[PDB]
């Protein structure tokens, strides 16, 4: 099934890491990303990706992982999450905040779900379809930091009322230095500032 | 021990008692020893049954007829609100300002509602200087950040048309009082009966669409589950609310909730104080614009602007009034439109796609005033809405509990997806749909239901079941027997006034039997 | 696309669908009500009240005006209804109403008062308004203490004779911003009733515990529980005939509606079914179930709010009592001038006199036995034309099932129930009562 395939294709995401060279966490350490768009998991799990939003989603997701790994703050999860998009030109267009797949199901970064759900204080069991996975190393700091997995040039910041309610369409005209209050679920509002 | 008697009691009863028995005691002697005589018995039964002249017809020699409805001018509209003929601002929500007084505000600010300038001539309207001078009056208000309304000249007149007058004590009467004023008793009116609604048709397939925006009703969790019945229970419910939460009817649904909410805190809070209060709605989704599937985006829908007039809980149960603004644009209809004043105030923007980016196109806008009265009742029974999804549910559980009996196994969804049910006439031709589409329908038969609940409408309601079990007799060949159906008829014919619904569902009862006689025999042509 | 929402019971059946078409769980109407009740008990005598000097219109055992017998008709027959009552006797047993009116006394001995305060609504009879039980029970108790001390009773036998020798009181007080009232005045607020009281709550009550324990033995009695067990009863019912009759014989089903089932019971016949059935008991309640039938036998009406008048333009518009209407009947239309002037009569002051029917919603169970009464009839005219029925009935809807041999000897049947039914008040409505074969009928919404 679509979703079993999904599943699988997780699993074998989850062991590439395998506490070891050539694998997730070295390449991390070394900052090259671009090889991580080119892995065979990815290009095993990309015919499950919608055809239409293909180039948009590949855009974001590479973005997403750039950022977080240019600046060593990153949260293997969201990581995991987006990973499978970016094997594929990107290509210019409107994202509205749901990785779409082929089975007309959604995959929202930074937010928890059936098909793929992180709980803090479980980041060894990583809950997909409501079965959890041990993950094969251990982590209690590298996942701490997900200010920069939820949108793409933005970083969380300190909670501001004053700030104005946006939408993502408003995004691309915030003037540098301006923080913008937005919602980053259902009814979870979150302060960010462009950077 | 014994009850002890008095006198008065004892003389009524040795007085209430036969004719033939002047005292309790004859009548109780007769009583404890009364024997059986049934021959005496059966002679007045039958002599009961020979002056005594009861028809009895089968209703297949003498069969029903079609019924006659009224005529006249067509019903007008009847609802507070305008279902589909609304056009809705909208704002992006704020949880720290979710209230009517800040999302009216905040609308204010940007502008577009102070830039509304209703113009002076009116398209078809009867006091338009009124409710043009109360708009300025609300707009000059919500600048001030108080919804209230300190001078009250034009809510009080358009709330006393109806009645306002003096009172003079009968202590003060006299005859010449009398023959000089020339009073004479307060003669009842009666509604003038109308006749077919045209444009029903219209707003029920406007309700079976779906809306761009979604999730508009609220509702509450679901607790957890200890074994197969609530799973299967909780599936099934989580599918219908998905299926249902993007239809239009909803919008009104959840439009009537807040309104209504709001109107009740305000008159609880600040009665005998004219208020102003926001017809406004919460959205939860939307349809992406690049593609159908649903993704996130709460917003703040604005159809209008309510005022209501002094409430105190008081005079004729409480009722009170209020004055709606609504927004529209589309021109209106004089037979339709005959409770609305309206007005054109300026111009308006839509916006829609174009490939990767939404742009806007200019309209011109329309300004649907109107005085109506409402009620704590009223209140009551329309603020809870949601009560006709749970009854829609009812429908869903007898298909799907009656096929999975009699296969025994899990038939839901094959008879979700495959099930086919008519729901009218294309082109002479009968439609046929799955049941995922005939929910919409029955859903908005509830609605409606709710919406014009009534005297009318229950007593046809009532009197309509008769026919119909009648007719699934006939399905079945059974000899359906009557007395006098003619006043049956009489009877739902009287019941029908001034109620779009009635006359509507009358009028498919009778193409539904001309439809049914080629397969029944128990009806006219 | 012309949408019609009817055409869903084509291909399906009604009783799955038949919910959609049902949603979700004045002076002037008060006095055709009365005029109504005066009309259908078709009898012209006229006996005055000595107490108060007021005529009353008595219809009992005085059948007139025979034409036109198929509207309501209310007048009662005494000998037809001791007769059925012999024969439900005979068919349960001897000792059974002795049985359940001992089970009955029992049960209410150790009864306390209290429980009156368990009521949907009552009449005050001091500020005369309409309240909780409660509220004006504790106005009639601390008025009775302000004028001749407390009630110590603490129990219903004790209550009821309180009650009783306020029946006889000449002057009594009660809090008010204080004052007191007479006899006169004091019996007719007790028996007054607003579109009731307490004074006859108890007796009430214990009629309706009386025709509980009654309808409980009855097979055909659907009124004191429903559901699981209305499905039970419509079962074990529906089995019990098919092994009754035979291959030759066929049956029917009737779907019946009882109309005017309020205004057409007279507790006068009540009265003498209490009597007749208390007949063989303690005189204690042979006395005590005496009591509510005679206190509706005469029941106060209170007319609602008066009429208006109004000039022309309507600029003045004048408010007056029920009271004062007799006063201004020259101006009142015809309508409301035909409607009034036959009942200024049976005025008092601003009330009604009725001498009977019955509004409340009361003796419900006690109307049921009567209907099961009139069920469990049989004799020898129909066993030798094979013929027969039985059935089920509620306060005033039933449903009956008929047997006979033939198309034709039915119709005998159905016009010999008719008139069983009609001998004693219970009539039967036309446009909401019909029939068919015995797979399909309906009772209390369960479309069967």
């Given at each position: 099934?679509?979703?079993?395939?999904?599943?699988?294709?997780?699993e074998?995401?989850?062991?590439r890491?395998?506490?070891?060279?050539?694998?997730?966490p070295?390449?991390?350490?070394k900052?090259?990303?671009?090889?991580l768009y080119?892995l065979?998991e990815?290009?095993?799990?990309?015919?499950?990706?919608?055809?239409?939003?293909?180039?948009?989603?590949?855009?974001?997701?590479?973005?997403?992982?750039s950022?977080?790994?240019?600046?060593?703050?990153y949260?293997?999860?969201?990581?995991?999450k987006?990973?499978?998009?970016?094997?594929?030109?990107?290509?210019?267009?409107?994202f509205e905040?749901?990785?779409?797949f082929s089975?007309?199901?959604f995959?929202?970064?930074?937010?928890?779900?059936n098909?793929?759900?992180?709980?803090?204080?479980?980041?060894?069991?990583?809950?997909?379809?409501?079965?959890?996975?041990?993950?094969?190393?251990?982590v209690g700091?590298?996942?701490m930091d997900?200010?920069?997995?939820?949108?793409?040039?933005?970083?969380?910041?300190?909670?501001?009322?004053?700030?104005?309610?946006?939408?993502?369409?408003?995004?691309?005209?915030?003037?540098?230095?301006?923080?913008?209050?937005?919602?980053?679920?259902?009814g979870?509002?979150r302060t960010?500032?462009?950077? | 021990?014994?009850?002890?008697?008095?006198?008065?009691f004892?003389?009524?009863?040795?007085?209430?008692?036969?004719?033939?028995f002047?005292?309790?005691?004859?009548?109780?002697?007769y009583?404890?020893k009364?024997?059986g005589?049934?021959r005496?018995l059966?002679?007045?039964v039958?002599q009961?049954?020979?002056?005594?002249?009861?028809?009895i017809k089968?209703?297949?020699?003498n069969?029903?007829?079609?019924i006659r409805?009224?005529?006249?001018?067509?019903?007008?509209?009847?609802?507070?609100?305008?279902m589909?003929?609304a056009?809705?601002?909208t704002?992006?929500?704020?949880?720290?300002?979710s209230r009517?007084?800040?999302?009216?505000?905040d609308?204010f600010?940007?502008?577009?509602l102070?830039?509304?300038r209703?113009?002076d001539?009116?398209?078809?309207?009867?006091?338009?200087?009124?409710?043009?001078?109360?708009?300025?009056?609300?707009?000059?208000?919500?600048?001030?950040r108080?919804?209230?309304?300190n001078?009250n000249?034009?809510?009080?007149?358009?709330?006393?048309?109806?009645?306002?007058?003096?009172?003079?004590?009968?202590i003060?009467?006299?005859?010449?009082?009398?023959?000089?004023?020339?009073?004479k008793?307060?003669?009842?009116?009666?509604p003038?009966p109308?006749?077919?609604?045209?444009w029903?048709?219209?707003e029920?397939m406007?309700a079976i669409?779906?809306?761009?925006?979604?999730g508009?009703v609220?509702?509450?969790?679901?607790?957890?589950?200890?074994?197969?019945?609530?799973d299967?229970?909780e599936?099934?419910?989580?599918?219908?609310?998905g299926?249902?939460?993007?239809?239009?009817?909803?919008?009104?649904?959840?439009?009537?909730?807040?309104?209504?909410?709001?109107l009740?805190?305000?008159?609880?809070?600040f009665p005998?104080?004219?208020?102003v209060?926001?017809?406004?709605?919460?959205?939860?989704?939307?349809?992406?614009?690049?593609?159908g599937?649903?993704?996130?985006?709460?917003?703040?829908?604005?159809?209008?602007?309510?005022?209501?007039?002094?409430?105190?809980l008081?005079?004729?149960?409480?009722?009170?009034?209020?004055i709606?603004?609504?927004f529209s644009?589309?021109?209106?209809?004089?037979?339709?439109?005959?409770?609305y004043?309206?007005?054109?105030?300026g111009?308006?923007?839509?916006?829609?796609?174009?490939g990767?980016?939404?742009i806007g196109?200019?309209?011109?806008?329309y300004?649907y005033?109107?005085?109506?009265?409402?009620?704590?009742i009223?209140?009551?029974?329309?603020?809870?809405?949601?009560?006709?999804?749970?009854?829609?549910?009812?429908?869903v559980?007898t298909?799907?509990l009656?096929e999975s009996?009699?296969?025994?196994?899990?038939?839901?969804?094959?008879?979700?997806?495959?099930?086919?049910?008519?729901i009218?006439?294309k082109?002479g031709?009968?439609?046929?749909?799955?049941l995922?589409?005939?929910?919409?329908?029955?859903?908005?038969?509830?609605?409606?239901?709710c919406?014009?609940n009534?005297?009318?409408l229950?007593?046809?309601?009532?009197?309509?079941?008769?026919?119909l079990m009648?007719?699934?007799?006939?399905?079945?060949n059974?000899?359906?027997?009557?007395?006098?159906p003619?006043?049956?008829?009489?009877?739902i014919?009287?019941?029908?006034?001034?109620?779009?619904?009635?006359?509507?569902?009358?009028?498919r009862?009778?193409?539904?039997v001309?439809?049914?006689s080629?397969?029944?025999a128990?009806?006219?042509? | 696309?012309?949408?019609?929402?009817?055409l869903?019971?084509?291909?399906?059946?009604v009783?799955?669908?038949?919910?959609?078409?049902y949603?979700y769980?004045?002076?002037?109407?008060?006095?055709?009500?009365?005029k109504?009740?005066?009309?259908?008990?078709?009898?012209?005598?006229?006996?005055?009240?000595?107490?108060?000097?007021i005529?009353?219109?008595k219809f009992?055992n005085?059948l007139?005006?025979?034409?036109?017998?198929?509207?309501?008709?209310?007048?009662?027959?005494?000998?037809?209804?001791?007769?059925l009552?012999?024969?439900?006797?005979?068919?349960?047993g001897?000792?059974?109403?002795?049985?359940?009116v001992?089970?009955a006394?029992?049960?209410?001995?150790?009864?306390h008062?209290?429980?009156?305060?368990?009521?949907?609504?009552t009449?005050d009879?001091?500020?005369?308004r309409?309240?909780?039980?409660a509220?004006a029970?504790?106005?009639?108790?601390?008025?009775?203490?302000?004028?001749e001390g407390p009630?110590?009773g603490?129990?219903?036998l004790?209550?009821?004779?309180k009650m009783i020798?306020?029946?006889?009181w000449?002057?009594?007080?009660?809090?008010?911003?204080?004052?007191?009232?007479?006899?006169?005045?004091?019996?007719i607020?007790?028996?007054?009733?607003?579109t009731?009281?307490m004074?006859?709550?108890?007796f009430?009550k214990?009629?309706e515990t009386?025709?509980?324990?009654?309808?409980?033995k009855?097979?055909?009695?659907?009124?004191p529980?429903?559901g699981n067990?209305?499905?039970?009863?419509?079962?074990?019912?529906?089995?019990?005939?098919?092994?009754?009759?035979?291959?030759?014989?066929?049956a029917?089903n009737?779907?019946g509606?009882?109309?005017?089932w309020?205004?057409?019971?007279?507790?006068?016949?009540?009265l003498?079914?209490?009597?007749?059935?208390?007949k063989?008991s303690?005189?204690?309640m042979?006395?005590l179930?005496?009591?509510a039938?005679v206190?509706?036998?005469n029941?106060?009406?209170?007319?609602?709010?008066?009429i208006?008048?109004?000039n022309?333009?309507?600029?003045?518009?004048?408010?007056?009592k029920?009271?004062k209407?007799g006063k201004?009947?020259?101006?009142?239309?015809?309508?409301?001038?035909?409607?009034?002037?036959?009942?200024?009569?049976?005025?008092?002051?601003?009330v009604c006199?009725?001498?009977?029917?019955?509004?409340?919603?009361?003796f419900?169970?006690?109307?049921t036995?009567?209907?099961?009464?009139?069920?469990?009839?049989?004799?020898?005219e129909?066993?030798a034309?094979?013929?027969?029925?039985?059935?089920?009935?509620s306060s005033?809807?039933?449903?009956?099932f008929?047997?006979?041999?033939?198309?034709?000897?039915?119709?005998?049947?159905?016009?010999?129930?008719?008139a069983?039914?009609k001998?004693i008040?219970?009539n039967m409505?036309?446009?909401?009562?019909?029939?068919?074969?015995?797979e399909?009928?309906?009772?209390?919404?369960?479309?069967?």
């Open positions: 099934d679509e979703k079993t395939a999904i599943t699988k294709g997780y074998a995401l989850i062991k890491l395998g506490t070891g060279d050539n694998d997730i070295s390449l991390i350490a900052k090259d990303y671009l090889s080119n065979p990815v290009k095993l799990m990309a015919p499950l990706i919608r055809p239409n939003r293909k180039g948009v989603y590949s855009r974001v997701a590479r973005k997403l992982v950022t977080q790994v240019t600046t060593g703050h949260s293997l999860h969201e990581l995991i987006v990973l499978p998009f970016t094997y594929f030109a990107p290509k210019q267009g409107m905040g749901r990785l779409f089975n007309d199901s995959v929202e970064p930074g937010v928890n779900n098909v793929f759900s992180w709980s803090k204080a479980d980041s060894s069991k990583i809950y997909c379809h409501g079965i959890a996975i041990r993950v094969p190393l251990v700091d590298e996942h997900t200010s920069l997995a939820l949108l793409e040039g933005f970083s969380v910041c300190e909670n501001d009322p004053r700030a104005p309610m946006v939408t993502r369409q408003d995004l691309i005209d915030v003037g540098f230095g301006q923080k913008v209050r937005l919602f980053v679920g259902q979870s509002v960010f500032k462009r950077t | 021990i014994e009850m002890k008697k008095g006198k008065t004892l003389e009524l009863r040795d007085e209430s008692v036969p004719l033939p002047q005292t309790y005691e004859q009548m109780k002697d009583c404890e009364f024997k005589n049934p005496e059966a002679s007045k039958s009961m049954q020979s002056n005594i002249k009861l028809p089968h209703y297949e020699q069969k029903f007829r079609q409805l009224p005529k006249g001018p067509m019903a007008p509209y009847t609802h507070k609100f305008l589909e003929e056009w809705m601002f704002k992006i929500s704020d949880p720290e300002r009517a007084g800040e999302i009216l505000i609308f600010k940007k502008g577009n102070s830039a509304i209703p113009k001539k009116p398209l078809q309207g009867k006091y338009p200087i009124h409710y043009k001078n109360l708009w300025n009056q609300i707009k000059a208000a919500i600048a001030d108080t919804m209230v309304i001078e000249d034009h809510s009080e007149f358009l709330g006393g048309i109806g009645r306002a007058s003096k009172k003079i004590p009968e003060s009467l006299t005859q010449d009082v009398i023959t000089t004023e020339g009073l008793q307060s003669e009842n009116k009666l003038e109308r006749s077919f609604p045209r029903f048709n219209a029920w406007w669409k779906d809306s761009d925006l979604t508009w609220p509702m509450a969790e679901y607790p957890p589950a200890d074994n197969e019945l609530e299967y229970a599936h099934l419910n989580k599918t219908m609310e299926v249902l939460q993007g239809t239009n009817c909803a919008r009104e649904m959840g439009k009537c909730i807040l309104t209504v909410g709001a009740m805190t305000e008159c609880r809070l005998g104080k004219i208020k209060v926001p017809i406004y709605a919460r959205s939860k989704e939307r349809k992406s614009m690049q593609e599937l649903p993704v996130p985006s709460e917003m703040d829908c604005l159809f209008g602007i309510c005022v209501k007039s002094k409430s105190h008081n005079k004729d149960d409480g009722m009170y009034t209020i709606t603004f609504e644009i589309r021109e209106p209809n004089l037979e339709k439109h005959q409770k004043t309206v007005f054109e105030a111009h308006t923007t839509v916006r829609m796609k174009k990767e980016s939404v196109r200019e309209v011109p806008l300004l005033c109107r005085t109506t009265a409402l009620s704590k009223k209140n009551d029974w329309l603020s809870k809405a949601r009560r006709c999804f749970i009854t829609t549910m009812d429908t559980e298909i799907c009656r009996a009699k296969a025994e196994e899990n038939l839901v969804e094959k008879t979700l997806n495959e099930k086919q049910m008519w009218g006439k082109n031709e009968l439609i046929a749909q799955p995922r589409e005939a929910l919409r329908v029955q859903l908005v038969q509830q609605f409606y239901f919406i014009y009534d005297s009318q229950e007593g046809f309601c009532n009197e309509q079941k008769k026919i009648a007719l699934e007799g006939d399905k079945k059974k000899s359906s027997f009557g007395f006098n003619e006043g049956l008829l009489e009877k014919e009287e019941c029908l006034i001034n109620n779009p619904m009635c006359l509507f569902m009358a009028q009862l009778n193409e539904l001309i439809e049914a080629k397969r029944g128990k009806f006219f042509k | 696309m012309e949408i019609n929402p009817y869903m019971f084509l291909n399906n059946d009783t799955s669908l038949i919910s959609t078409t949603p769980t004045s002076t002037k109407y008060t006095l055709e009500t009365i109504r009740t005066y009309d259908y008990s078709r009898t012209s005598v006229e006996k005055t009240s000595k107490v108060f000097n005529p009353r219109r009992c005085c007139e005006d025979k034409d036109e017998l198929v509207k309501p008709t209310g007048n009662v027959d005494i000998s037809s209804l001791l007769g009552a012999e024969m439900m006797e005979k068919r349960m001897e000792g059974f109403f002795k049985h359940c001992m089970e006394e029992t049960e209410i001995l150790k009864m008062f209290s429980r009156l305060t368990e009521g949907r609504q009449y009879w001091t500020s005369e309409n309240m909780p039980a509220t029970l504790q106005l009639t108790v601390d008025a009775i203490k302000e004028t009630f110590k603490t129990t219903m004790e209550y009821c004779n020798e306020m029946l006889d000449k002057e009594i007080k009660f809090k008010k911003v204080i004052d007191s009232i007479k006899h006169d005045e004091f019996l607020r007790a028996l007054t009733i607003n009731p009281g004074i006859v709550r108890p009430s214990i009629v009386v025709a509980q324990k009654i309808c409980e009855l097979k055909e009695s659907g009124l529980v429903g067990e209305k499905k039970a009863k419509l079962k074990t019912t529906v089995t019990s005939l098919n092994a009754r009759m035979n291959s030759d014989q066929f029917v009737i779907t509606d009882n109309s005017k309020n205004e057409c019971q007279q507790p006068e016949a009540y003498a079914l209490l009597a007749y059935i208390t063989d303690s005189d204690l042979k006395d179930c005496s009591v039938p206190l509706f036998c029941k106060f009406v209170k007319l609602g709010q008066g208006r008048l109004s022309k333009r309507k600029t003045k518009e004048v408010i007056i029920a009271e209407m201004y009947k020259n101006l009142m239309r015809e309508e409301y001038k035909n409607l009034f002037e036959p009942l200024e009569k049976y005025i008092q002051k601003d006199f009725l001498p009977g029917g019955m509004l409340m919603g009361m419900n169970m006690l109307s036995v009567l209907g099961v009464s009139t069920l469990c009839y049989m004799d020898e129909l066993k034309k094979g013929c027969f029925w039985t059935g089920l009935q005033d809807d039933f449903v009956l008929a047997v006979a041999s033939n198309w034709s000897n039915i119709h005998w049947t159905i016009r010999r129930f008719n069983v039914c001998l008040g219970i409505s036309l446009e909401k009562s019909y029939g068919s074969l015995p399909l009928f309906e009772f209390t919404s369960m479309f069967f």
